[PDB]
RNA sequence: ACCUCGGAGCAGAACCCAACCUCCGAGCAGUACAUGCUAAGACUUCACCAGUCAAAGCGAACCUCAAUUGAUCCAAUAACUUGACCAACGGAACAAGUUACCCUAGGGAUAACAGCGCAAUCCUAUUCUAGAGUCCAUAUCAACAAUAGGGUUUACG
RNA sequence: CCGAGCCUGGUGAUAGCUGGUUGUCCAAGAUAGAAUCUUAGUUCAACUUUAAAUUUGCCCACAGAACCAAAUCCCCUUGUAAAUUUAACUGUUAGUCCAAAGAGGAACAGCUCUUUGGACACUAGGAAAAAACCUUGUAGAGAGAGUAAAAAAUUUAACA
RNA sequence: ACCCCUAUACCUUCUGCAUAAUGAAUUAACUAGAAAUAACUUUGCAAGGAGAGCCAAAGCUAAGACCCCCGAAACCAGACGA
């Protein structure tokens, strides 16, 4: 049902975080905080990392 | 733990302990929390935080560790800028 | 078959009249056997804790639920026209005063 | 606490044309409310015809009679069977 | 062991035989009100408060109201802001005095100034400190105004046909507490004018120490039946001006009753320094505000499951110490 | 048959408390993406390991849910991170039968015989008067039941 | 003495298993739980011993400890004297009956399983003999004294 | 001297043994706690100690004081035997 996915920030590169999403649906894009940049920034899904 | 070695006839260190722990000169034993680089997704942030801290070992545990190592690991070591240097000696104790 | 779960060790950790420092947990429970009162907080377990240095006291205080929390409101509505619910509350009554003005210098 | 004199202070469980017809029904309901009688339910039953109901329970003969009189004092009625006239209405009782 | 209740239990009378006959508070507001009422009531079970805590006139009024309604005719309502000044004036005339008591109680003037015992300030006192040409900064009861604005003595009115106007700081600065510092003392005044009445102690500005908090000065006004003597030159010595109003009231003000009050808040400012230096002739005291230190439990020999931060909590201080090498 | 986790009773009023005791369930979902950093002070499943709560501060706005999980070393990863119904669930990196052809160390801490306790079952005697006995409860049988006693049985311990 | 010979060597093989552990005298001294290829063992905890440092420790009295019995917790006074911490350890971690509240089983067991409290595994007197019921504990000598627990009771069917 | 009264050998193993649980005919001689880290103790010296190296935010050097015996079936190497 749910996939684990890694999400890569465009600005503040190097910072990746792991999240859930349903396997059936769209590649995920999300606003989230980069502590490197110290601002909210768009992350994009890249590579699933185990499924469950 | 080899109380007398075959050739030198000295005690040996269990090197597992050396790999895993840091003996402060005061004889506290510092350890990385277990389960700290594992299944971090399912873990709540607070739990993660908890798991990323170092911890001091129990008295009994400390004693065990002392027994498990030789007097070399208990010496005073004057490192240039070890981040733990300030914790070796102890300040303002009272029983 | 079935489960054999360990004892949960919940209940009061600090009783009325005990000196309780800010942060001390006062009572742990599932559901509200006690409620947070003056200077007493609630964790995600419903566990009650002291928000200031002081003395614990217990009191039976009239209970009004939050308007937004529906089930309680409904219950209240259901009650007859001279009824009041009542519930037990845990307070810390603070001891040491937050402030004391000291003389720095004569300028 | 059980043994304390403030035992069950928290205890709470023990305490706990069509348009015209509609208007008439509403009025009846209001009257019932005023006079302190249990209005259980009301229905929206199906040229055209339209029915409305006001289910009532528990009322003494004299009081009941009074109520009936007030209702009487347009369209129609139907509950002893007590019909009358000036779409449709049917105040079913349960005395 | 089942003990009976000491007094009557709550929820006893209302349960009754049947539940379906009663009215029930279908709303929340009613319930809330009930709760409030209950709270207000005392009870026997400790509880919160233990541990912490003409006809003609009426007719005339009615007539006026009717007239107003007629004038409106209502349409306006179907958005009229109303004149506020007039309302204020009315309040002053009538229930202003009543109101004033509450404020006084809140501010602890009756407990500190008069040692207990409340009284209504009937006669409305109207003071204002002049700031340039206009506007005159009015000393409404409770207001914050700076000691720069209070450098020179104010203008006073009250519309009353003898009086004794007084002004005192309630905190008791510098020296030990249960003391007060008077700022002036006007005496044996005929009518509305200050210049006509005598003055024993002349005006100082407020002189609140830096970071000492906020102080509460108080103007006092009494009714004179009999003219009386009082007691000291244009002085800036502090040991003379230290006096408490309670004792004064007791041992002297016997043919006298207070009728007018206004209290006034004060903070630090640049004039305070001047006051300290020029006329008082001393170094101004600086007041910080020190909180009590952080707690921490006793120093444990083997901390066990605390982080490496355990040792940073018990240390004097920060810099790296080198024992003997 | 079960072996890990949780809720209710036993366990009626601070915790704690067993059994191959009685009963429900879990090994997930949903909403977010500041489920950001850190940090006083506590609780803790009777050890340890694991868990829990958390004021202030700095950053920002203007979590729900009972259980819903798994160590170390190793792997896989530029790194962040991710790896088991390791379900015998504190996990040995990977292991099956059979032995009257058997052996050794032990054990009355655990059976078969025997004893012993108990007496469910069993055997007997009273009480009771339903009913059979052409009628008639007691010549003779005897239901429902009750009160005692025995230690033939098969069990149980 | 063939399910795989015999001898020597590795070999003082290895045993969570059994048996055995030798001068005197004194003192303190008993079985909450954990996990565990683990319940014949172990390692933590608990209890126990010693040497320290200390300030409180036990008894506790009003207040107080939800809703859906017995009692307990907390607890100032008070009677007392110790308890907490630090430094070293070993050993117990296969228990029994009695009273009480329960559970399984037969409302069986000298049956099985929890909890509270006794006792026993440590002398004595009693209850016939007796582990666990009752009286009783700090020691030695006396050809002195007062006590404690402490010895089962019954006997019975007329009737007009 | 018996006769009177009191008196359930010992060790081990046990929840519990006079037990009808083990062992022991008796004498003789032989026959079983051995190791340092870390503690404590008393000396020595002491911001140093130690007969190099090692340790040292009162240490260091010194001694003293703790840690059994008997027993398989077995496995393997090399000889010797029809
Ligand atoms: N899913 C897993 N997660 C973590 N470690 C694993 C996993 N599977 C195998 N291992 C490790 O891999 C090692 C080698 O086993 P494999 O089956 O070859 C084991 O010792 C385990 O520790
Ligand atoms: Mg614990
Ligand atoms: Mg915060
Ligand atoms: Mg055969
Ligand atoms: Mg064959
Ligand atoms: Mg054999
Ligand atoms: Mg047996
Ligand atoms: Mg036996
Ligand atoms: Mg018959
Ligand atoms: Mg051997
Ligand atoms: Mg002794
Ligand atoms: Mg038994
Ligand atoms: Mg048994
Ligand atoms: Mg034997
Ligand atoms: Mg082998
Ligand atoms: Mg031949």
Swiss-Prot record, chain A:
Keywords: Mitochondrion, Ribonucleoprotein, Ribosomal protein, Transit peptide. Coiled coil: none annotated. The chain holds residues 14 to 65 of 65 of the full protein. One of its GO terms (biological process) is mitochondrial translation. GO terms for molecular function: structural constituent of ribosome. Its main location: mitochondrion. GO terms for cellular component: mitochondrial inner membrane; mitochondrial large ribosomal subunit; mitochondrion. Component of the mitochondrial large ribosomal subunit (mt-LSU). Mature mammalian 55S mitochondrial ribosomes consist of a small (28S) and a large (39S) subunit. The 28S small subunit contains a 12S ribosomal RNA (12S mt-rRNA) and 30 different proteins. The 39S large subunit contains a 16S rRNA (16S mt-rRNA), a copy of mitochondrial valine transfer RNA (mt-tRNA(Val)), which plays an integral structural role, and 52 different proteins. It is found in: Mitochondrion. It comes from the Eukaryota. The keyword Heme does not apply. It comes from Homo sapiens. This is Large ribosomal subunit protein bL33m. Belongs to the bacterial ribosomal protein bL33 family.
Curated annotation (Swiss-Prot), chain B:
Its main location: mitochondrion. Keywords: Mitochondrion, Ribonucleoprotein, Ribosomal protein, Transit peptide. GO terms for biological process: mitochondrial translation; translation. GO terms for cellular component: mitochondrial inner membrane; mitochondrial large ribosomal subunit; mitochondrial ribosome; mitochondrion. One of its GO terms (molecular function) is structural constituent of ribosome. The keyword Lyase does not apply. It is found in: Mitochondrion. Belongs to the bacterial ribosomal protein bL35 family. Component of the mitochondrial large ribosomal subunit (mt-LSU). Mature mammalian 55S mitochondrial ribosomes consist of a small (28S) and a large (39S) subunit. The 28S small subunit contains a 12S ribosomal RNA (12S mt-rRNA) and 30 different proteins. The 39S large subunit contains a 16S rRNA (16S mt-rRNA), a copy of mitochondrial valine transfer RNA (mt-tRNA(Val)), which plays an integral structural role, and 52 different proteins. This is Large ribosomal subunit protein bL35m. The lineage of its organism: Eukaryota, Metazoa, Chordata, Craniata, Vertebrata.
UniProtKB/Swiss-Prot annotation, chain C:
One of its GO terms (biological process) is translation. One of its GO terms (cellular component) is mitochondrion. It is found in: Mitochondrion. Transmembrane segments: none annotated. The keyword Ion transport does not apply. Component of the mitochondrial large ribosomal subunit (mt-LSU). Mature mammalian 55S mitochondrial ribosomes consist of a small (28S) and a large (39S) subunit. The 28S small subunit contains a 12S ribosomal RNA (12S mt-rRNA) and 30 different proteins. The 39S large subunit contains a 16S rRNA (16S mt-rRNA), a copy of mitochondrial valine transfer RNA (mt-tRNA(Val)), which plays an integral structural role, and 52 different proteins. Belongs to the bacterial ribosomal protein bL27 family. This is Large ribosomal subunit protein bL27m. It comes from Homo sapiens (Human). The lineage of its organism: Eukaryota, Metazoa, Chordata, Craniata, Vertebrata.
UniProtKB/Swiss-Prot annotation, chain E:
Residues 54-79 form a coiled coil. CDD domains: PEBP_euk (cd00866). InterPro entries: PEBP (IPR008914), PEBP-like_sf (IPR036610), PEBP_euk (IPR035810). It is found in: Mitochondrion. The keyword Coiled coil applies. Gene3D superfamilies: PEBP-like. Pfam families: PBP. One of its GO terms (cellular component) is mitochondrion. Keywords: Coiled coil, Mitochondrion, Ribonucleoprotein, Ribosomal protein, Transit peptide. Transmembrane segments: none annotated. GO terms for biological process: mitochondrial translation. The keyword Ribosomal protein applies. Component of the mitochondrial large ribosomal subunit (mt-LSU). Mature mammalian 55S mitochondrial ribosomes consist of a small (28S) and a large (39S) subunit. The 28S small subunit contains a 12S ribosomal RNA (12S mt-rRNA) and 30 different proteins. The 39S large subunit contains a 16S rRNA (16S mt-rRNA), a copy of mitochondrial valine transfer RNA (mt-tRNA(Val)), which plays an integral structural role, and 52 different proteins. mL38 is located at the central protuberance. PANTHER family: LARGE RIBOSOMAL SUBUNIT PROTEIN ML38, PHOSPHATIDYLETHANOLAMINE-BINDING PROTEIN. This is Large ribosomal subunit protein mL38.
């Amino acid at each position: 049902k749910n996939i684990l996915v890694r999400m890569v920030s465009e600005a503040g590169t190097g910072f990746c975080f792991n999240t859930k999403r349903n396997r059936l649906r769209e590649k995920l894009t999300l606003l989230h905080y980069d502590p490197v940049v110290k601002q909210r920034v768009l992350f994009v899904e890249k590579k699933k990392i185990r499924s469950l | 733990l080899t109380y007398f070695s075959a050739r030198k006839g000295k005690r040996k260190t269990v090197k597992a302990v050396i790999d895993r722990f840091l003996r402060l000169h005061c004889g506290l034993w510092v350890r990385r929390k277990a389960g700290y680089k594992k299944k971090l997704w399912k873990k709540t942030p607070a739990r993660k935080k908890r798991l990323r801290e170092f911890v001091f070992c129990n008295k009994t545990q400390s004693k065990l560790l002392d027994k498990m190592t030789t007097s070399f690991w208990k010496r005073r070591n004057w490192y240039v800028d070890d981040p733990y240097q300030k914790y070796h000696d102890r300040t303002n104790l009272k029983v | 078959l079935g489960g054999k779960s360990s004892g949960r060790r919940q209940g009061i950790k600090k009783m009325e009249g005990h000196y309780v420092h800010a942060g001390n947990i006062i009572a742990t429970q599932r559901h509200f056997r006690w409620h947070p009162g003056a200077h007493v907080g609630v964790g995600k377990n419903k566990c009650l804790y002291a928000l200031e240095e002081g003395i614990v006291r217990y009191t039976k205080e009239v209970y009004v639920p939050h308007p937004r929390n529906t089930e309680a409101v409904d219950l209240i509505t259901r009650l007859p026209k001279g009824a009041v619910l009542y519930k037990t509350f845990v307070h810390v009554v603070p001891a040491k005063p937050e402030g004391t003005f000291k003389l720095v210098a004569m300028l | 606490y059980k043994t304390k004199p403030t035992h069950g202070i928290g205890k709470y469980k023990h305490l706990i044309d069509m348009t015209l017809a509609e208007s008439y029904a509403q009025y009846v309901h209001n009257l019932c409310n005023s006079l302190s009688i249990k209005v259980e339910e009301s229905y929206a039953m199906p040229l055209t015809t339209h029915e409305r109901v006001v289910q009532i329970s528990g009322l003494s003969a004299t009081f009941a009679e009074i109520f009936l009189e007030i209702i009487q004092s347009g369209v129609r009625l139907s509950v002893x069977x007590x019909x009358x006239x000036x779409x449709x209405x049917x105040x079913x009782x349960x005395x | 062991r089942r003990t009976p209740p000491l007094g009557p239990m709550p929820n006893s009378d209302i349960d009754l035989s049947n539940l379906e006959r009663l009215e029930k508070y279908r709303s929340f507001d009613r319930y809330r009100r009930r709760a409030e009422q209950e709270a207000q009531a005392p009870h026997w079970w400790r509880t919160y408060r233990e541990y912490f805590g003409r006809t003609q006139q009426l007719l005339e009024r009615k007539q006026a109201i009717q007239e107003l309604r007629a004038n409106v005719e209502e349409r306006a309502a179907r958005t009229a802001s109303v004149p506020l000044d007039a309302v204020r004036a009315e309040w002053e005339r009538t229930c202003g005095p009543y109101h004033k008591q509450r404020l006084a109680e809140y501010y602890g003037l009756y407990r500190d100034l008069f040692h207990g015992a409340t009284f209504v300030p009937r006669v409305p006192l109207h003071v204002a400190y002049a700031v340039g040409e206009d506007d005159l900064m009015p000393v409404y009861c409770g207001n914050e105004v700076t000691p720069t604005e209070a450098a020179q003595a104010p203008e006073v009115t009250y519309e009353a046909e003898l009086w004794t106007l007084l002004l005192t700081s309630l905190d008791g600065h510098l020296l030990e507490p249960d003391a007060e510092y008077l700022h002036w003392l006007l005496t044996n005044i005929p009518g509305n004018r200050v210049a006509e009445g005598q003055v024993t102690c002349p005006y100082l500005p407020p002189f609140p120490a830096r970071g000492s908090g906020i102080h509460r000065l108080a103007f006092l006004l009494f009714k004179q039946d009999q003219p009386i003597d009082f007691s000291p030159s244009p002085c800036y010595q502090l040991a003379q001006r230290t006096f408490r109003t309670f004792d004064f009231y007791k041992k002297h003000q016997e043919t006298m009753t207070p009728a007018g009050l206004s209290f006034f808040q004060c903070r630090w400012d640049d004039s305070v320094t001047y006051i300290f230096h020029q006329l008082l002739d001393m170094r101004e005291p600086v007041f910080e505000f020190v909180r009590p230190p952080p707690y921490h439990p006793k120093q444990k020999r083997f901390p066990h499951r605390q982080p490496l931060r355990y040792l940073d909590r018990y240390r004097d201080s920060h810099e790296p110490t080198y024992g003997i090498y």
